[PDB]
Each structure stands twice: as structure tokens, then as C-alpha cells.
Amino acid sequence: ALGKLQDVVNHNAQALNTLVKQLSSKFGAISSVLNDIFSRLDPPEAEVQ
Amino acid sequence: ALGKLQDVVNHNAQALNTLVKQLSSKFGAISSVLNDIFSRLDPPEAEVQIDRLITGRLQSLQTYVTQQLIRAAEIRASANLAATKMSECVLGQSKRVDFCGKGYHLMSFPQSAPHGVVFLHVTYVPAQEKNFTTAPAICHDGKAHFPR
Amino acid sequence: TMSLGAENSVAYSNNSIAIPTNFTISVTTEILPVSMTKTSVDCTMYICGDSTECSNLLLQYGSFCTQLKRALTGIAVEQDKNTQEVFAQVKQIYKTPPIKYFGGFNFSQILPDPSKPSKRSPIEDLLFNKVTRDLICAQKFKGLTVLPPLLTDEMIAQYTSALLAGTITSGWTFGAGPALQIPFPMQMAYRFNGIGVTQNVLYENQKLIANQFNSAIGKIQDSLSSTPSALGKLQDVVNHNAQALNTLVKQLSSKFGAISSVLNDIFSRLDPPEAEVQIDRLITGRLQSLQTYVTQQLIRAAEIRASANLAATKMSECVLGQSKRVD
Amino acid sequence: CTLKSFTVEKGIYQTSNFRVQPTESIVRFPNITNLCPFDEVFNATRFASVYAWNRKRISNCVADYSVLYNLAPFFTFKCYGVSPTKLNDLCFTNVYADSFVIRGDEVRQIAPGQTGNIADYNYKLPDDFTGCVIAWNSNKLDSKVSGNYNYLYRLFRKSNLKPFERDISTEIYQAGNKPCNGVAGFNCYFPLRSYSFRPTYGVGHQPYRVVVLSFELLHAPATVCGPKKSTNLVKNKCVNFNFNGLKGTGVLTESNKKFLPFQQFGRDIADTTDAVRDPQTLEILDITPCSFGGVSVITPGTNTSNQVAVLYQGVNCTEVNVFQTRAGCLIGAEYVNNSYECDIPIGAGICASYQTSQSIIAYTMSLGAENSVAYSNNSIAIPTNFTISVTTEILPVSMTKTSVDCTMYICGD
Amino acid sequence: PAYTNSFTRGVYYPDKVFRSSVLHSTQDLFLPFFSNVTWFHVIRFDNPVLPFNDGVYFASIEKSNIIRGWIFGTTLDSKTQSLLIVNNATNVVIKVCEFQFCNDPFLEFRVYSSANNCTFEYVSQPFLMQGNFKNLREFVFKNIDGYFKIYSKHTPIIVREPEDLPQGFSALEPLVDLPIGINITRFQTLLAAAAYYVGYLQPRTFLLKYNENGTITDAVDCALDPLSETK
């Protein structure tokens, strides 16, 4: 019935879920926690990470 | 004449060719090939080069996907226009000017085409006109007479 | 709380009809964008400025300097085509007759004025006076240029006059096929006979129709007056292009993760083994900013193409004939 | 070349950009001849310790940084922000030298990032390191045991130190909330631990005289710089310039600006260097880029001819037949006073085509023929015959569906 | 004591860069608009020990030579460093010589506590110092990791109600940039009517407009009201 009405809602839901899930995805780094990288590895390379 | 259909085909071909050729461009590494990097350098040093390469390739793929989405939106607008024209011209006469061809629309015959549709609009075009003296109405013996 | 409107109450009944007894001719107006501001960027100058070594290091990068220029050229061609599918639908350029006695009307503010050297109408004169080191020269020294349109203002004015001289002399014949001369009191009668009103109302109230039309033209002349919020749909695209070009010349002063923001300071303070580590982050950031600008320009060009198709449909239906589509 | 093909179609194609190359080089530096004396610096007998730094903010000089290249063996140069061999052309504002006799393998802790005891409560550097670090083996001069009490070393502090902050302290530490009142009781001593030395000591136990002099590269008038020369200053000529380290290209004309006595440099709307002050006698200049532009080639087609027409976009025919339009300087065509349909769009309403010898002609666009439909008070035009015509429209309806593989395109086998 | 306002005064050139018709914004140490100012009548010994928290906005209203001293220092008892600055007709006497400090700051030069080993001196010729327009003299101060910047601009001021900081924008250009490494955290004036308009500084974003003559005409503080925040 509401195909085009639920389509936009599902698209927005998927977009928000992807955007909130890519925060726990290492973009080529040691880890994904900001504090752990800032404190538990080293000051200098923390900037690069 | 047949350029609107070749346009999308050539655009997709050029996009695919550019995406393939993007694999032969060093994004800041010693070589485009990955095995030579993973064989001639140690893991920690080659890690930076392979990360630069994977980042460049992912960015190129994302740019391709964005261009494909924009082109798909444009082609969806074109397909909706074509459907409206086929539904208002073929499936019945339309009194819209220039919509079903230039002139007084009479018929429209649809035909298949590669990645498109080629309509055949039949239009009524007057010709061989002559000048005549006209008037809004004529006067009778006391009443008026307008053309019905 | 927002007011949705007034509160009317129609009195429905088994036997009750409302038949009008007087007409009120009114002339409204609509604003539709057609074209945009064609732009062209310089890859070897926006990314690398007076930094030849930077060009030698960017040549290794992927073919990103050839797809963005191609996209901008396609956008420019599309914007140059939108001014031909709207303002150019009649092949023969018509000319208004010398005398001005079209029925009893006063088509003097829409027809071109030969006095001023612009060959435009008072309405067009009022329109071309409200839609606008300098910033233009500053953006030029960094790749961002503005290509001039194909059809100039005089050609568009002649096209609008041709679409107007064929609408007064002829009716809807010059749109379909060859132009056919028809008196204007009769053209308006045939147009009134297309909404339901018989032709026995115009010929009996022609002077009143002429006066109402003149008053409507007069009120339209004051609707596009000093009031700023009139030509908002034409200045919005200009402001968007301006804020887009300003956001792109501002990105050249942002550290994308380097020790500086000049391509001539990193290559004069660091060494080649370490130069390729801090000079590539800035290049990557500038390429991302340019790609973002190109994507925004593509979306804007798609919106402008949709608006131009709508304007062409309007010019074809409303101007080149009569349309029975409400609103 | 720009589009890979040996058969180009009929149209206008952007190829490259017109640019004028420089033909000279300006390296005007501030006229100064005095040399920074190195007697009051690390090259001396009396040294200091980490308890009391030796910070000498030197003045303007022409000291060449390539002088200590023949210093004692094992002279490390870890420049975290600059390059060692490049310290011969940059003009620094002010150099902040330092001196200390830190002992042991903790020489790596002097560099930024490390959080050793020396980096915790004996010394600290900001996270920029605008200079270099100079450290060498100091054993032939510190072999005797008489320098033990002369080389101090602080102890732990209840609070972290500050970068560029001296830590001179002589009180007694107080652990928790129990003041020992001068006399050293339990967990309370004086942070004046003297380093122990020995002539025939270990390799890692030997002290190292370390110099951590830094700089500051900014808009302030530079004082110290490398030894270079100076040349004349041209005005109406696009050349290279190296004014006070600012390297770039473009014309250097005379400006009518109003630079205040304290304003040296000058930027534009986009934060780009548009004007600079000469390091010599005060003169206001204007850094304008070289005369550039954009080219465009008008080609009638590959297999129809071999002639072309260049379109220098944004040129007034006085910066590069010849035709000056409102879009550039078209060089290679001729403007005929006729009017035809547009075949090759150029700009400003002046298209081109390949018509009759055979040459590329330029002409104003023809909007169409001129028809004058007579309008009288009583004149109708009723047609007397019909001509059925069949037109055709070409509209796309679909697109080739594509699919990509990440594990095969982004990453090979 | 009293409290005068600080309407649109306390703006200075942050960097040494000429800009024409721009809208720049830096996170420097300016003076908050519409802030309290410790109005002290030194006509009467008004000699407080006001701190030097992140800067000061010392101003003065006099006739000829009333206020001529801005001695600095933090622990001014016997050993701390200081910054003596008098404005005699010849030149400035800028000094950093640590020496004795007398409790009485009265001045000719009469303090002269003690002379000893110094670290830096300055005899700069460009000294820091209509009839009805007596003087509107303000002196901005700030302690950075490097040099000790000093901003000032002597402008005429009209006569009006009892002396208060007038309304009107005026940028402060720098005069001296002497290098120093002092750890000063206090303030002390010297004089032999007065304004003593001390105003404390603090970090705040200030959007400042530059004219086509290289002069600041107006500036937002971006923290006063939501209108400025939107501006």
C-alpha cells in the first residue's frame, strides 16, 4: 500500500544507521576510541591517527 | 538525430574506462601494483603506501557512485517525461502545444529503441493561407448576429 | 499559531447556483529560473599555485583534473542549451507593426522601446536593474573563472519580442505552424470562447476589458517595484553561486594536517623524504573540496535543468496557445 | 592529446591554460653583516644544568647554520618540523637557544612526545619543535668528578611542568599532607639530586650536552637568516621573488597602499600574499600573479580540414586574423559581416563554421529570418490546405545497470 | 572605587598583516565589550596592587604629566624582576633589572630603590607618550611566551559629564615589542585628577572589520548577546 511512503522512511533510517555505525569503524587506525589513541599509544602519532 | 541515446551509452563507457584507468595511477606510493609493494617492502613501511592506494581507490569508486546516482536521477526524470508523453499522446489525443510534436497533434506511434523510445508524432500543419476581410458580427434589421 | 486562512462557509442546498455577473481581468506573475552562471576551474592552478614541484607531484595522482573539467564543460553546455529550449521555439523572428492600435489596449510596457539603446521594455528595464580589489578579480587568480553565456541580452530581448509580436498579431497559429493574421478583438473573443464565456460579452464590453487590462499592467509595473522580495527566485541562484565560490577560495587557507598552508613553504622548510608526507595531505584536501564543489554544481545544474524544462513547458502552453490546466 | 583520439569531432575543446614563465630570480634579503658570536653558546667551557637553563635570545645576524658540521663526533640532528640541510635559506624571526647537561640515555626524552622523568619534571618542549636538537658525546670535558655537584638534577614534582618554563626550586617536597619542615624525614627530600659521574664509566652513563634551540616562522620581521646575496628589483616584469623567505612567482609592481609602520606583509580576501615590504629601504610593493589565461581550439573536424582557431579566454588581444570578442581573443578566423546559423558555439553570440578557398569564419548568430505579419483592423488569414507532417522525438528510458566488486577492484588478488 | 563601562573600546590589531575590506576573526586576547572597569581616582593616593590576569587595559585622563609610570612585577619585595617605564621628554627607560621595591610608589625620579646586575635595557627614542581636548590615552598590555607587546593610541576627547570611558570605536596600534621572559602577575602605577581605568582581558572570539585604508572601524565580540552570536 504505502510503498513510496515507507521507501523514504526506510532510506532515511538506513542512512542514519550507516552514519551512526561508521563511528565504530577504524578508518585505517590502531583503534576507534579517541581517548585510547590520545593517551595509550603516544602523543606524536596520535595527531596522525 | 540519434544522439540522446548514444549520450548515456558513451557517458557510461567513459565512466567505466576512467574507473578502470584509475588503477594505473600512484596516489603517493612507489608503484601502482600492490604485490610488488607487499614483496619489496616490510609490512610497517608498506602499510602507509597501501593505505594511500586503498584510500585513493575508494575515493575514485565513491566519485563514480555519486556520478552514477546523479545520472540515474537525470535518466529517471527523462523516463518520467517519456512516460507522460506516451500516456498523453499515444493513449489519446492531447491539446497541449508542442507536447505531442510541433503543431496540432493528431496521433503518436511509439517504437522501441536501445535504452530509449522513439515516438512518431502526427501533426496537423495548415498551409496555403489567403487574406480575407473579416468582422466581429453582422447587423440584421435590428438584431445582431455573432458566429456560433 | 499559524493562520491557515480565513473562515468561509459555502451554503450548499438542493436548489442553489451562484452565477457571476461581472468579470475582473487580472494579470499575475511567476518567476522561473532558466540558466545559471557557467564556471571553469584550473586544476594546475587551484591545487598548486606557483609551485611547479607540486604539479610534478600531482601528475602522479589519478586523473581527477580531467573529469572535473569535463563535468564543468557539460554543465556549461547544458546551461547554454536551456536558453535555447525556452527563449527559442519560433524560427522566424517576427516584428511588431509600426502603428499601435491593438484593439483598445496599451501594449507599450511589454513591447521593446526603441528610444533607449538596449531595445527592451520598461518591465524588462525594471527587471534588469534589481538582479545583480574586487572579489571577481580575486577569484580569477585562483582558477575560478566565469565563462560568458552564448546568447547575450540583446538576443534574448529579440527572442522575447518575437514571441510577443507573434502573440498579438497572430493567436496560436504561429506556434503550431505558419503565422496567420487575426484581429486582436477577435483573438480575445476566441480565447474567451475557450473558457466557457460566449463571444457576446467581449464585443459588448471591449472598452471595460481594455481598461481593466491597462490597470492590471499598471499594477504589475508597481508589483516589481523597489519591494525587495519580488525577484527572489532569480537572486537565490546568484547568491548560492557566490557563497559556493567564496567557500572554495577559503578552503585554500585551511591546514588539512600539514605544518603550513603554502605550497612554497613546505618545499622550502622540509626535505624531499619528508616533503611528500605533508604536501600530499593539502593536495588531498583541496581535491576533496573541488570534488564537493563539482558535486554541488551538478546538483544545482540538475535543479536548473528541471526549472528550465518547466519554463519551456510554460512558454509552450501558456504563451504559444491557451491551456485549460488549472493554476 | 587532451582527448585520446586521432579523429576529433567538430566543436570547441579546452586543452590547456596560457601561462608566462619567469625569466629571473629576486633574492633580496635584509642588508646586515654582523655574525652571531658562538662564544656565549654551546661552543664554550662553562655549561649549565637542567636546574638553571641558559636561554639566550640572540639578535639579528647572518650566522650560517652550516658551521657546526665539523663538531664533535656523534652530532645528532633531529629536526621535528624543519630540515637540517635546509637551514641555509629560511629567515627566522627569533632563535631561542638553550643549554643543559642531561646525563644518560634519556636524550630521546628531550624530543617532544616522550614522557620520561626528564620530560616530566626536568624539561619540556611545546608540541611544535620549530627548531632542531643538537646533542653530542661529552666525556673528555666531564671526565673528572669535580663536575658532579656542578650538574644538578631535579626530582619528582606534585604537578606537571609547563613547556618553556624554568623549574628553579629550593624548597622541600611534601608528600600528602605531612609537612616535614625543612628536615628530611620520610618521603620528603630536596629536589637537588646531584648526578654521579666517573672517568672510566659506561657508555650510556656518559652525559650529553644537548642544545634544543628553536625558531618561530611567522609574519614578524625576521632577524636571523642564512648568508645569501641580493639582486635588483624590477617592476613591470613577471619574475621570481624570495623576499624574506616568501617564495613565489608573479609581477612585483609599485603599490599605492597605506601600509602602517608595523604592518610588514599583506594578504587578500582568500588569505593569499598580495603585497610585501622590501627588506631594504621601505617601499610598498604589490605581488600580482603572472599574466595567465585559458586557451580554446576551434576545430571544424578531423576529416574535413586541418586548420584550427585558438581562443585565448580572458585576453584583450594585448596580453598574448585577430578578433576581440566579449569572450576572448580569437586568433585564426575572420569576422564576416554576414549572418548564418550557429555551427560551433564560442561565446557572446559569435559562432564559427568552416565555409567558403576554405577557411574558418566568425559571424554573429542568426536568430532567424525577419517576417512582418501585417495587422489590420479587419484582416483574417484562414488556411485553404493541410500538410500532414510526422516528426520524431528521442527520449531515453533506461540505463545500463552496473555492479562493482570491492574485493576485486579496490584490492587485487 | 568605582565602575565605568567599556562600550566599544579595547580592540587592537592582532597580527602584523595588512588587509583591505575583509572580515577576519581570531581567538586573541581582547577586552570584553560592556564590562566592568576599576575606576580609581588617583588625585589622594590610589595605589592598589591590582593583578595582571591575562593582560590589562590601562587608560588615563590627565593634563600634562600626571600619570607617567607603569612599573610591573609579581613578588615585588627584594628579588623579583620588573618592568620600569617612565615617559620623560628624552626617551623611555624600559628596564628588566631585578632590584629592591619600595612600598611608596611616589615619583621627577625619586624611587631609585637599588641598582644591581640587569638582563635587558631599552632607551628607544619613540617614547610612548586644541586646549579643550585634554587627552584620551589608553595602554593595552599582554604577557606572551615571547615579547611583551604594548598597544596605545593618543586621541583627543571632548569635555562632558564626569570622566568615563567615552563611546566610539578606536583601534590600538602597537608601539614596542621588547623581548622579555618575566613572570609578572601584578600591577603598579607611578605619579608625582586621574582615571586609572584598569580592565582585565580574557580569551574571546572577535570578528573585526577592516576598512579600505587599513583601519578597524567596528568589531563584534560574539559573546555579548545572541544577536552578536548570529552576527
Ligand SMILES: *[C@@H]1O[C@H](CO)[C@@H](O)[C@H](O)[C@H]1NC(C)=O
Ligand atoms: C433538501 O435538502 C435537505 C438538506 O437541508 C435534505 O434533507 C432534503 O432531503 C433535500 N430534499 C430534496 C428533495 O433534495
Ligand SMILES: *[C@@H]1O[C@H](CO)[C@@H](O)[C@H](O)[C@H]1NC(C)=O
Ligand atoms: C465590474 O467591475 C469593474 C471593476 O474593475 C468595474 O469597473 C465595472 O464597472 C463593473 N461592471 C459591472 C457591470 O458591474
Ligand SMILES: *[C@@H]1O[C@H](CO)[C@@H](O)[C@H](O)[C@H]1NC(C)=O
Ligand atoms: C486601423 O488600424 C490602424 C492601426 O492599427 C489605426 O490607426 C486605424 O485607426 C484603424 N482604423 C479603423 C477604421 O479602425
Ligand SMILES: *[C@@H]1O[C@H](CO)[C@@H](O)[C@H](O)[C@H]1NC(C)=O
Ligand atoms: C499607455 O500607458 C502609458 C503610461 O505611461 C501612457 O503614457 C500612454 O499614453 C498609454 N498609451 C495609450 C495608447 O493609452
Ligand SMILES: *[C@@H]1O[C@H](CO)[C@@H](O)[C@H](O)[C@H]1NC(C)=O
Ligand atoms: C639597510 O637596511 C635598512 C633596513 O630598513 C634600510 O633602511 C637601509 O636603507 C639599508 N641600507 C643599505 C645600504 O642597504
Ligand SMILES: *[C@@H]1O[C@H](CO)[C@@H](O)[C@H](O)[C@H]1NC(C)=O
Ligand atoms: C581592451 O583595450 C582597449 C584599449 O586599451 C580598451 O578600450 C578596452 O576596454 C579593453 N577591453 C577589455 C575587455 O579590457
Ligand SMILES: *[C@@H]1O[C@H](CO)[C@@H](O)[C@H](O)[C@H]1NC(C)=O
Ligand atoms: C493541397 O496540397 C496537396 C499536397 O500537399 C496538393 O496535392 C493539392 O493540390 C493542394 N490543394 C488542394 C487539395 O486544394
Ligand SMILES: *[C@@H]1O[C@H](CO)[C@@H](O)[C@H](O)[C@H]1NC(C)=O
Ligand atoms: C559591575 O558594575 C555594575 C554596574 O556598575 C555593578 O552593579 C556591579 O556591582 C559591578 N561588579 C560586578 C561583579 O558585577
Ligand SMILES: *[C@@H]1O[C@H](CO)[C@@H](O)[C@H](O)[C@H]1NC(C)=O
Ligand atoms: C607565572 O606566574 C604565575 C603566577 O602564580 C605562576 O602560576 C606561573 O607558574 C608562572 N609561570 C608561568 C610560565 O606562567
Ligand SMILES: *[C@@H]1O[C@H](CO)[C@@H](O)[C@H](O)[C@H]1NC(C)=O
Ligand atoms: C582612504 O584612502 C584613500 C586613499 O586615497 C583616501 O583618499 C581616503 O581619504 C581614505 N579614507 C579614510 C576614511 O581614511
